[PDB]
Amino acid sequence: VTGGSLNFDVTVGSNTVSLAGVTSTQDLADQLNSNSSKLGITASINDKG
């Protein structure tokens, strides 16, 4: 990630969202975990990132 954010769309089955502010592994993990309930997925970050 250099010079800007990696804003992208998240499509899972029927419901579909588009996150923003994608700059690192942890940021993604966090916003997906906040949004997993909507998408019906399980965003889990391990000790190794």
The smaller minimum CB distance to another protein, of residues 2 and 14, is found at 14
DSSP state of 3: S
DSSP state of 13: S
Q: Which of 7, 11, 15, 24 binds another protein (CB under 8 A)?
A: 15
Q: Which of 6, 34, 40, 45 binds another protein (CB under 8 A)?
A: 40
Continuous segment of H or E residues that includes residue 38:
helix 25-39
C-alpha span between 1 and 27 (Å, rounded): 12
Q: Is 16 in the site for another protein (CB under 8 A)?
A: no
Q: Which residues bind another protein (CB under 8 A)?
A: 14-15, 40
